[PDB]
Amino acid sequence: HRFLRH
């Protein structure tokens, strides 16, 4: 997964 790009 990912730590998103927020």
Give one DSSP letter per residue of 1-6, joined into a string.
------
Burial profile 1-6: b = 16 or more Cβ within 10 angstroms, e = fewer:
eeeeee
| Cα–Cα distance for residue pair 6/1, rounded to 1 Å | 14
Backbone angles phi, psi at 4, to 5 degrees: 50, 180
| Cα–Cα distance for residue pair 6/3, rounded to 1 Å | 8
Solving technique: NMR
| Cα–Cα distance for residue pair 2/4, rounded to 1 Å | 5
What is the chain's Cα-based Rg? 5
